[PDB]
PDB file of C-alpha atoms in Angstrom:
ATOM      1  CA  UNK A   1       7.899  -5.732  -8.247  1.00  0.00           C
ATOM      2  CA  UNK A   2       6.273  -3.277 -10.237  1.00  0.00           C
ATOM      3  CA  UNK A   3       5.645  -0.503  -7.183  1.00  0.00           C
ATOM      4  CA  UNK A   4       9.425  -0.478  -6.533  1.00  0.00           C
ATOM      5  CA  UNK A   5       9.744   0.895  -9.729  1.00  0.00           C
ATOM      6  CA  UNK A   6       7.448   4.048  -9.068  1.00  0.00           C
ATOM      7  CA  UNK A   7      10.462   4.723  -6.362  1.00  0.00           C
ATOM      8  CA  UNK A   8      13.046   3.758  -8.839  1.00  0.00           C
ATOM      9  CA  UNK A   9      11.573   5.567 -11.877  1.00  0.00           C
ATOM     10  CA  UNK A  10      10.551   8.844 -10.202  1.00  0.00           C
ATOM     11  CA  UNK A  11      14.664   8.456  -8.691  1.00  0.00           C
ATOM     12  CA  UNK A  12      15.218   9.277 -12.183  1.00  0.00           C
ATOM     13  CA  UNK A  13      12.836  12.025 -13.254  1.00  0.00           C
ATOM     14  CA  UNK A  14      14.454  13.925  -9.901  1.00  0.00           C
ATOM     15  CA  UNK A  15      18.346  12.955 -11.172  1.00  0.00           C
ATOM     16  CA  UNK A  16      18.096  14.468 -14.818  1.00  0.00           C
ATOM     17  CA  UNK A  17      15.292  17.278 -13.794  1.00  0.00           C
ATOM     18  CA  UNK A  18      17.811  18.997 -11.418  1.00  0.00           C
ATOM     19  CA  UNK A  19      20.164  18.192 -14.238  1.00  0.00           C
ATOM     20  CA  UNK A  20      18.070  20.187 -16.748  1.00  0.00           C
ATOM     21  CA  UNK A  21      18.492  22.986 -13.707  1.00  0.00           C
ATOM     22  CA  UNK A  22      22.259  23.054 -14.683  1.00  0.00           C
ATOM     23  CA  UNK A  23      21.919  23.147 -18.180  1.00  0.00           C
ATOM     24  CA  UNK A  24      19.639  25.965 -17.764  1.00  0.00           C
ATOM     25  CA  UNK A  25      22.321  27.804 -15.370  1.00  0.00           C
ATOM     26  CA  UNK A  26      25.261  27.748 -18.361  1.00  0.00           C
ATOM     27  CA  UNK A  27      22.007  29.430 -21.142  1.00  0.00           C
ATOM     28  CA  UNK A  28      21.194  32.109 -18.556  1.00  0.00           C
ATOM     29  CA  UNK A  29      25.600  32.812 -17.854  1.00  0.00           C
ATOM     30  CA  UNK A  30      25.943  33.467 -21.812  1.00  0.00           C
ATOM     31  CA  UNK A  31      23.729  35.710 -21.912  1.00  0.00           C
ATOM     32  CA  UNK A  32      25.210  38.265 -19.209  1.00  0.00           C
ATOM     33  CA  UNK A  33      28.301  37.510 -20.582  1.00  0.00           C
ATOM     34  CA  UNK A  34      26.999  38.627 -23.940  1.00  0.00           C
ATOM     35  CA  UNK A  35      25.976  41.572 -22.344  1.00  0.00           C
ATOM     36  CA  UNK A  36      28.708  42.800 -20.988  1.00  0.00           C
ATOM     37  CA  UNK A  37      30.302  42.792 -24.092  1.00  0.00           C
ATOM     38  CA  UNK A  38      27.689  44.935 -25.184  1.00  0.00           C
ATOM     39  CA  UNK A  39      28.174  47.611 -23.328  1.00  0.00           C
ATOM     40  CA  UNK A  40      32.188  47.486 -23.219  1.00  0.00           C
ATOM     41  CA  UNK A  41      31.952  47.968 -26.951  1.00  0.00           C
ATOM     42  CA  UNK A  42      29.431  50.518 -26.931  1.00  0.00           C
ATOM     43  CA  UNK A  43      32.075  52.729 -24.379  1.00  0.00           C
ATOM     44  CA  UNK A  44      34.797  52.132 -26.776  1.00  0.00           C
ATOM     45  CA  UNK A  45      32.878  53.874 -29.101  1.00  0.00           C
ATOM     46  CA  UNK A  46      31.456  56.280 -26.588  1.00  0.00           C
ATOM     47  CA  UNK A  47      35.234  57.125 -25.276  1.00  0.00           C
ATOM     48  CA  UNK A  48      36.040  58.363 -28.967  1.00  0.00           C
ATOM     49  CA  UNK A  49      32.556  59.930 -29.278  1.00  0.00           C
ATOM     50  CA  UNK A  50      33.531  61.709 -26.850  1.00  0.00           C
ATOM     51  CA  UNK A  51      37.039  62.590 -28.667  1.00  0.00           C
ATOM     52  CA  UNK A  52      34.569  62.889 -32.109  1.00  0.00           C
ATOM     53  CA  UNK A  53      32.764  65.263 -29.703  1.00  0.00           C
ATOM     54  CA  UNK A  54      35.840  66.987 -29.368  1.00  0.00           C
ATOM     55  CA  UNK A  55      37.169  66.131 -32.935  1.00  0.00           C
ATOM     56  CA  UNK A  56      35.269  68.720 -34.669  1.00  0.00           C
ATOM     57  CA  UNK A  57      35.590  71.235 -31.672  1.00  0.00           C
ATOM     58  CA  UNK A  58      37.735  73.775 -32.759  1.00  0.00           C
ATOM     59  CA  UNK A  59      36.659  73.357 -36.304  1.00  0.00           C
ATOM     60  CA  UNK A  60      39.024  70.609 -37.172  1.00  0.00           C
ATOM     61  CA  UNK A  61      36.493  68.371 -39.093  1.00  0.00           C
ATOM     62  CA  UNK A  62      39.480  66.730 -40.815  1.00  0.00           C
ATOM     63  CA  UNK A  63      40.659  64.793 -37.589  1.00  0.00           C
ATOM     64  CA  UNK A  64      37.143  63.487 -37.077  1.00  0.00           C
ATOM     65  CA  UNK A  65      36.686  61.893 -40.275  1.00  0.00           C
ATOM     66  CA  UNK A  66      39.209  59.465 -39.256  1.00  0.00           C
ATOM     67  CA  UNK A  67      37.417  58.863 -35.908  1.00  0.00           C
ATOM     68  CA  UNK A  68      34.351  58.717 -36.990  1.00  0.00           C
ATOM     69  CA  UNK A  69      35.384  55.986 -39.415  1.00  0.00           C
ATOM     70  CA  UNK A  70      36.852  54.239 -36.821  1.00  0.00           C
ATOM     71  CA  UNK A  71      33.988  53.776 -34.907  1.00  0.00           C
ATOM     72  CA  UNK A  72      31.704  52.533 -37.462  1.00  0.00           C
ATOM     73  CA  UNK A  73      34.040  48.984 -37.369  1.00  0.00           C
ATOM     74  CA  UNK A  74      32.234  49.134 -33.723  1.00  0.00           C
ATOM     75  CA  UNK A  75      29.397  50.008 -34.151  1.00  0.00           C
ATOM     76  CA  UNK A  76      28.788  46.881 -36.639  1.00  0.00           C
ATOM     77  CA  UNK A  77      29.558  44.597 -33.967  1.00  0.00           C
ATOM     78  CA  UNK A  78      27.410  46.328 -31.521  1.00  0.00           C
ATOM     79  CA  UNK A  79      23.958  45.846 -33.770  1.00  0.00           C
ATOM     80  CA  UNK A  80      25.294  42.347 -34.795  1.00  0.00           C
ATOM     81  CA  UNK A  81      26.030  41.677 -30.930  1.00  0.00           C
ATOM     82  CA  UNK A  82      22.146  43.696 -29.675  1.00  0.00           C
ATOM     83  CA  UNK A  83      19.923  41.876 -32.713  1.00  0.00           C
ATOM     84  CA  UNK A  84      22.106  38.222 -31.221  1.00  0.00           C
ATOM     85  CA  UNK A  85      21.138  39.406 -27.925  1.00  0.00           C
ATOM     86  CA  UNK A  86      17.719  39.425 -28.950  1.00  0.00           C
ATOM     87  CA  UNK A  87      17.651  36.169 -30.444  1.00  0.00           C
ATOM     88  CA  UNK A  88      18.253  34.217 -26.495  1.00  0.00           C
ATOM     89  CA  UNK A  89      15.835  36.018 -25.233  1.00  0.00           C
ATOM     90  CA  UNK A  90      13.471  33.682 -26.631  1.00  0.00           C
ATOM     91  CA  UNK A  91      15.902  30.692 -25.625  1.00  0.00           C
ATOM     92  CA  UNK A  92      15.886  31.831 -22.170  1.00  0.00           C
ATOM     93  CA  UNK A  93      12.131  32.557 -21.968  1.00  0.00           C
ATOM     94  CA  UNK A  94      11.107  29.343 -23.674  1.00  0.00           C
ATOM     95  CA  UNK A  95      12.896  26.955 -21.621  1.00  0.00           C
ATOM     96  CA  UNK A  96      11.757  28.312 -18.347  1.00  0.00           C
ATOM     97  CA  UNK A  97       8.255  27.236 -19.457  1.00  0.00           C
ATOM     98  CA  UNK A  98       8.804  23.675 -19.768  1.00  0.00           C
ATOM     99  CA  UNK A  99      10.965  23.429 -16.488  1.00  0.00           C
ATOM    100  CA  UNK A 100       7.820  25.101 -14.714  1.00  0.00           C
ATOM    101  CA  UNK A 101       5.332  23.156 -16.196  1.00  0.00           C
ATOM    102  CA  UNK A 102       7.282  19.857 -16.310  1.00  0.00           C
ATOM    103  CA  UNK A 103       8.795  20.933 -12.546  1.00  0.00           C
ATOM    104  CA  UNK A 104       4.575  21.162 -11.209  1.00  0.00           C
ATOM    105  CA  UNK A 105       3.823  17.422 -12.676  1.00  0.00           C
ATOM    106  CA  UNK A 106       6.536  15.924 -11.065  1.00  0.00           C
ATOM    107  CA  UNK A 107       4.878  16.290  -7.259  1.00  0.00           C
ATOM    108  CA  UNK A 108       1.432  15.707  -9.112  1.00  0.00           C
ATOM    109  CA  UNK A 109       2.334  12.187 -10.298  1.00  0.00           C
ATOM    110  CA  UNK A 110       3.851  11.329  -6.935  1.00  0.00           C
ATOM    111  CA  UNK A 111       0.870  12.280  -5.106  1.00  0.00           C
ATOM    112  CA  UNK A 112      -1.003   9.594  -7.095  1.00  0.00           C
ATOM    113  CA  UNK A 113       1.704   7.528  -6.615  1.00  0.00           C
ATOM    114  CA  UNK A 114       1.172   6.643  -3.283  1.00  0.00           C
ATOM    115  CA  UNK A 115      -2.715   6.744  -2.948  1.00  0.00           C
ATOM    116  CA  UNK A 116      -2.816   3.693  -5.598  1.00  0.00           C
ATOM    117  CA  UNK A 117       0.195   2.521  -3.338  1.00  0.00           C
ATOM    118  CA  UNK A 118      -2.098   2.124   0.137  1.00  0.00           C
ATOM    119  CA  UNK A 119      -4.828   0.832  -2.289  1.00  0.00           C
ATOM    120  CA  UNK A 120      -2.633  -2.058  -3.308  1.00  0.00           C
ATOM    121  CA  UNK A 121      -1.523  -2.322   0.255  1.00  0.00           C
ATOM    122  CA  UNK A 122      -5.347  -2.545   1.570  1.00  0.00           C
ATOM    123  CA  UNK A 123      -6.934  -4.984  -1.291  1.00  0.00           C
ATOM    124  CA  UNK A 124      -3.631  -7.249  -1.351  1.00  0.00           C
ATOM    125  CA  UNK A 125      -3.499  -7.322   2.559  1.00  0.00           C
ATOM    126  CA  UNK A 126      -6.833  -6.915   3.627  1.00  0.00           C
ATOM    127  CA  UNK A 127      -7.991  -9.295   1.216  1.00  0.00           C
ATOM    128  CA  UNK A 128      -5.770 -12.205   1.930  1.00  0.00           C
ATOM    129  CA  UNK A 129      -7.383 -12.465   5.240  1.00  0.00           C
ATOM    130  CA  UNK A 130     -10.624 -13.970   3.285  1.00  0.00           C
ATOM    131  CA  UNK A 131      -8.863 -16.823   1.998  1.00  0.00           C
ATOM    132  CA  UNK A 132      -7.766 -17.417   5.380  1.00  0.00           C
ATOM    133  CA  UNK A 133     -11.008 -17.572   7.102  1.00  0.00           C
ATOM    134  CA  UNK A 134     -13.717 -18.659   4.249  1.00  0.00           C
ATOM    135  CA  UNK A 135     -11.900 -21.929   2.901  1.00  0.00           C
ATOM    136  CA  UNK A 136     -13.389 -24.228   0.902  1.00  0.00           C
ATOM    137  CA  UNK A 137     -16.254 -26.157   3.192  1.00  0.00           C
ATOM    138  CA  UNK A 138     -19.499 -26.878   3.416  1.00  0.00           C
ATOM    139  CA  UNK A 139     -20.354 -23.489   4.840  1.00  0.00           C
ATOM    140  CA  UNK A 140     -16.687 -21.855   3.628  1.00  0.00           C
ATOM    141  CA  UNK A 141     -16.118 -22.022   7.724  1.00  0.00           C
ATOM    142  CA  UNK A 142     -11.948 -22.225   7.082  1.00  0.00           C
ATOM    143  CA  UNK A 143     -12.496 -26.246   6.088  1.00  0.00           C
ATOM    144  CA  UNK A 144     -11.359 -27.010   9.954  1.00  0.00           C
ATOM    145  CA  UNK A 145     -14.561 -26.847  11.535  1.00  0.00           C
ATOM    146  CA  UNK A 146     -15.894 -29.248   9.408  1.00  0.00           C
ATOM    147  CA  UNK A 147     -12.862 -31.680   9.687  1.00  0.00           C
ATOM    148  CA  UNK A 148     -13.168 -31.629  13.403  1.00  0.00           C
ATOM    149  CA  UNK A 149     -16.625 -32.139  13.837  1.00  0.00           C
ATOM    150  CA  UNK A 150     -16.147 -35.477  10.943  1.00  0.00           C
ATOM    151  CA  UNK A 151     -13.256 -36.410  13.884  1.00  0.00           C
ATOM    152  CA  UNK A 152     -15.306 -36.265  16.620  1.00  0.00           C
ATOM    153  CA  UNK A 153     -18.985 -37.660  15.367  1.00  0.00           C
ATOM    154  CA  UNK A 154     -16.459 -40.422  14.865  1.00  0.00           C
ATOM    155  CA  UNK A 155     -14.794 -41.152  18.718  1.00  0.00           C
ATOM    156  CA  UNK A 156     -18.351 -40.564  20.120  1.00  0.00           C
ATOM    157  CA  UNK A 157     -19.495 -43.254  17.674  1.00  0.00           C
ATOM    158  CA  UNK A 158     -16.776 -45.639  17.148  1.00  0.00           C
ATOM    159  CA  UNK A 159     -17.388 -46.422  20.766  1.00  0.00           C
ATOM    160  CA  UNK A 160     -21.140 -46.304  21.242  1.00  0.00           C
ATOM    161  CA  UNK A 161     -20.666 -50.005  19.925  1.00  0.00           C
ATOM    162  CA  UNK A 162     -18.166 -50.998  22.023  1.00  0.00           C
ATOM    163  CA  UNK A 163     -20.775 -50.172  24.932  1.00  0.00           C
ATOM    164  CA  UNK A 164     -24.371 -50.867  23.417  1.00  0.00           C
ATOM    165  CA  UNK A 165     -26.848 -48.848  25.140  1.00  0.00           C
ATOM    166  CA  UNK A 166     -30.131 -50.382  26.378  1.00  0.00           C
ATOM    167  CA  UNK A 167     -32.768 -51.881  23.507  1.00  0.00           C
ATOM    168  CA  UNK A 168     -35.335 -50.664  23.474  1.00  0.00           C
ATOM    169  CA  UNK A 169     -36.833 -53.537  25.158  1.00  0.00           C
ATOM    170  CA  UNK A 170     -34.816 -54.001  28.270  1.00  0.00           C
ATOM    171  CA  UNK A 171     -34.527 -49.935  28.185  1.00  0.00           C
ATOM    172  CA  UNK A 172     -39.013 -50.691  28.203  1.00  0.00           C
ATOM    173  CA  UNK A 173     -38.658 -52.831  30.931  1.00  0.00           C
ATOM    174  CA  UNK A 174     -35.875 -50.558  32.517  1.00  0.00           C
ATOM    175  CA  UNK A 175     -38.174 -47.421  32.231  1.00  0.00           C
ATOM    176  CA  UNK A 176     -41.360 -49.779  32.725  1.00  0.00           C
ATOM    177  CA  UNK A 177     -39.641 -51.389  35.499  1.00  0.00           C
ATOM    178  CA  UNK A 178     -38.227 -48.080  37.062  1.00  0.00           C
ATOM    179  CA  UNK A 179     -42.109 -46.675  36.203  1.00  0.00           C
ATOM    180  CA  UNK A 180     -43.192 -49.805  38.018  1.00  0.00           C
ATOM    181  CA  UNK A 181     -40.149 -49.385  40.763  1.00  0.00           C
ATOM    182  CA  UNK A 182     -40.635 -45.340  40.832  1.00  0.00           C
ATOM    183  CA  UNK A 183     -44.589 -45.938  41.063  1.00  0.00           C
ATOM    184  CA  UNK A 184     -44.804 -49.713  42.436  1.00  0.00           C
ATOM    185  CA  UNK A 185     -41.972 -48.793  45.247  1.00  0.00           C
ATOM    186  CA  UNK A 186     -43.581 -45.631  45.331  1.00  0.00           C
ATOM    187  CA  UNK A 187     -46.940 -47.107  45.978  1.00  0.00           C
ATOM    188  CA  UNK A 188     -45.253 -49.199  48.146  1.00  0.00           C
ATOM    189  CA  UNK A 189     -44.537 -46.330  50.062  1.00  0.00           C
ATOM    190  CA  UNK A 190     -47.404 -45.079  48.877  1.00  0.00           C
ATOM    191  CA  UNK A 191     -49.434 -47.376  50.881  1.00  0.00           C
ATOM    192  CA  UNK A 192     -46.736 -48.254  53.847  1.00  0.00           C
ATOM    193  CA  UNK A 193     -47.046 -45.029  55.337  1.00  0.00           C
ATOM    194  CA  UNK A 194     -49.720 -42.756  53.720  1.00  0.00           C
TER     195      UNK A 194
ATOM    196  CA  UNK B   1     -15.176   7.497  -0.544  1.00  0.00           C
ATOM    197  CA  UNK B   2     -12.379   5.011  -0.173  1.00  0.00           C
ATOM    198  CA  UNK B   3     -11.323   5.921   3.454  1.00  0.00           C
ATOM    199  CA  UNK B   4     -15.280   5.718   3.821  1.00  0.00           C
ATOM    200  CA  UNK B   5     -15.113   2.037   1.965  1.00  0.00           C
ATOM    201  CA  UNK B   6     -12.110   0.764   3.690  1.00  0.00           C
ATOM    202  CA  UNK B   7     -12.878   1.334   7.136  1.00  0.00           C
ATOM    203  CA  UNK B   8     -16.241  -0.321   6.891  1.00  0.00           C
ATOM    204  CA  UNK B   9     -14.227  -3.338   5.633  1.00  0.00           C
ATOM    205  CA  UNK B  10     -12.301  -3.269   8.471  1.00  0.00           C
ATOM    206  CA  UNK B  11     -14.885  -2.941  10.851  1.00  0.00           C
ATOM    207  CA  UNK B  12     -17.055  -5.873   9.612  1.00  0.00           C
ATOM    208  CA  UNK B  13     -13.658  -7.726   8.816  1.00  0.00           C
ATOM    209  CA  UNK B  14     -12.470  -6.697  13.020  1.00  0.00           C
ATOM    210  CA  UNK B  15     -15.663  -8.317  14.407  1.00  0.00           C
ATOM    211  CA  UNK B  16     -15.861 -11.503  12.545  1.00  0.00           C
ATOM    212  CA  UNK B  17     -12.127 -12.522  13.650  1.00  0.00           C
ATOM    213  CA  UNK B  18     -12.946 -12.607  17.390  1.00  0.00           C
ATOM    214  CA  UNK B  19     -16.281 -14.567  16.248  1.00  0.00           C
ATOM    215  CA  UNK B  20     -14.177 -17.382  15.036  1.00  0.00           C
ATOM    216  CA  UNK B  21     -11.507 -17.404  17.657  1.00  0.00           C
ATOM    217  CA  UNK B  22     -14.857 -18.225  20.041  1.00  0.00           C
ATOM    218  CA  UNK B  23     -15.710 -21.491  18.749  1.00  0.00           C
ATOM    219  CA  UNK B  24     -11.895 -22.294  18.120  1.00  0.00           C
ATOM    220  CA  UNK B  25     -11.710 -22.813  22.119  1.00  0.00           C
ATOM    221  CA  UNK B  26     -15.330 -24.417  22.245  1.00  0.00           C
ATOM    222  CA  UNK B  27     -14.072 -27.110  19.435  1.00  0.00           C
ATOM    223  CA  UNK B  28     -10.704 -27.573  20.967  1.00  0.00           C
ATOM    224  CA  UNK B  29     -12.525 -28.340  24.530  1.00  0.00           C
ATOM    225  CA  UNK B  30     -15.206 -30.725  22.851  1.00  0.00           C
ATOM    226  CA  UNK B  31     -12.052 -32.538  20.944  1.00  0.00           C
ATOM    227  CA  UNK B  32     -10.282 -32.759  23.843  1.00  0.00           C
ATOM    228  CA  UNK B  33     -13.050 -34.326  25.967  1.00  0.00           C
ATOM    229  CA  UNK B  34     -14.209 -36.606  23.249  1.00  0.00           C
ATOM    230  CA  UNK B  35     -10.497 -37.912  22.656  1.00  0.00           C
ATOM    231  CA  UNK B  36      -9.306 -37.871  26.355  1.00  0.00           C
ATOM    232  CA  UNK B  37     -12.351 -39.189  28.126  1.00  0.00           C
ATOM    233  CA  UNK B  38     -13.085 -41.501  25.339  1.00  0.00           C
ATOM    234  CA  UNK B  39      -9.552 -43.451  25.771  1.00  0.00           C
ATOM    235  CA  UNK B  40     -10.560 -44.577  28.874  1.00  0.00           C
ATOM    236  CA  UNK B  41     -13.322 -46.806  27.467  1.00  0.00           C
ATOM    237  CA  UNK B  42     -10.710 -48.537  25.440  1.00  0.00           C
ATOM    238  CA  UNK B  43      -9.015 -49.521  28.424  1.00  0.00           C
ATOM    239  CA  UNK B  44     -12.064 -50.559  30.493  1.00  0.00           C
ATOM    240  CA  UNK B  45     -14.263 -52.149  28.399  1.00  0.00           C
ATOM    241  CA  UNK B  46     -11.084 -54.262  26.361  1.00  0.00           C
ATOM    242  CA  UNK B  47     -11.796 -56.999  24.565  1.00  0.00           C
ATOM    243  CA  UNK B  48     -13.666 -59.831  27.033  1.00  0.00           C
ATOM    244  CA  UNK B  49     -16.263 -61.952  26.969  1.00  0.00           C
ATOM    245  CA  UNK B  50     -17.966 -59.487  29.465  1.00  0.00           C
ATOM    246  CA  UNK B  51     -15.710 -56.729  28.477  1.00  0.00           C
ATOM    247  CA  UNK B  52     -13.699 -56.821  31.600  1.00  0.00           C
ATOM    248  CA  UNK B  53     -11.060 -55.072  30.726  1.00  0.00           C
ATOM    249  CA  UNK B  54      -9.805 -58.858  29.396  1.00  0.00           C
ATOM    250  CA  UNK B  55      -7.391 -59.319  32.003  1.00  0.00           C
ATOM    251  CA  UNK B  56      -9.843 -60.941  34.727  1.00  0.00           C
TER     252      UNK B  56
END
């Protein structure tokens, strides 16, 4: 039953798409994640540029050396973590396309799917009527008619033996003789009281 | 076009069924008369030498 599958097929394209909606859900959570990391790192360093702000106040250079080479092993993870950041972007941006496109043909297919549906429905139903009424007869009039008729040209001669009807002789001399009666009685009344 | 197409099927398709279901009745009620009034000849005129029904 091929149009059950249309039901059972599009089933499918509905259980993995939302699936697809998921997968989507965990790309999109890295990348905050990622983010906040970001940031958290960037205060680190921001909480002893603000000390290295203070380092050389005073004058004392000497203490800020070693801060400011401390935060360099933070800052190296901050431009590896922003150019990474970068990178899913893309990811992000690139998979939404095909879940919008993809998510617009789904209802477009199923829209089809049921107009060739009621045309099935309407030349397979419809059309079954026709073999039904024009069966094979004489004049395709559902073979019964003819059958019948065959039946009863039969009875109302497989009888007309059994009770001959007049020759055409004694059905003469009936007619001549009911002529003659209907205008030989008739003259007879003709004549008896004219 | 289609609902256009179908419906004229269904019109033309809508009259012709009550055309048939006309003569169904007409056939039955010849049948019947041709069947029911013609047993009675069969036990009239039986098998005689005037066809009297044989039993005279």
């Amino acid at each position: 039953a091929p149009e059950d599958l249309l039901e059972r097929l599009l089933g499918e394209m509905e259980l993995e798409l939302i699936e697809l909606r998921r997968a989507l859900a965990q790309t999109i959570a890295t990348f905050k994640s990622t983010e906040r990391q970001r940031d958290a790192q960037q205060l680190i360093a921001q909480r002893w540029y603000e000390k290295a702000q203070a380092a050389l106040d005073r004058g004392n250079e000497q203490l800020a050396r070693e801060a400011l080479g401390q935060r360099q092993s933070y800052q190296s993870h901050t431009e590896a973590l922003g150019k990474s950041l970068g990178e899913q972007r893309a990811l992000v941006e690139q998979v939404r396309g095909q879940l919008q496109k993809l998510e617009r043909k789904y209802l477009e297919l199923k829209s089809q799917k049921n107009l060739y549906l009621a045309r099935l429905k309407s030349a397979i139903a419809a059309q079954k009527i026709e073999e039904i009424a024009g069966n094979l007869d004489n004049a395709s009039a559902s073979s019964l008619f003819e059958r019948i008729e065959t039946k009863i040209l039969e009875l109302e001669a497989e009888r007309e033996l059994l009770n001959p009807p007049p020759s055409p002789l004694d059905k003469k001399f009936e007619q001549w003789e009911e002529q003659q009666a209907v205008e030989a009685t008739l003259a007879a009344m003709k004549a008896r009281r004219s």
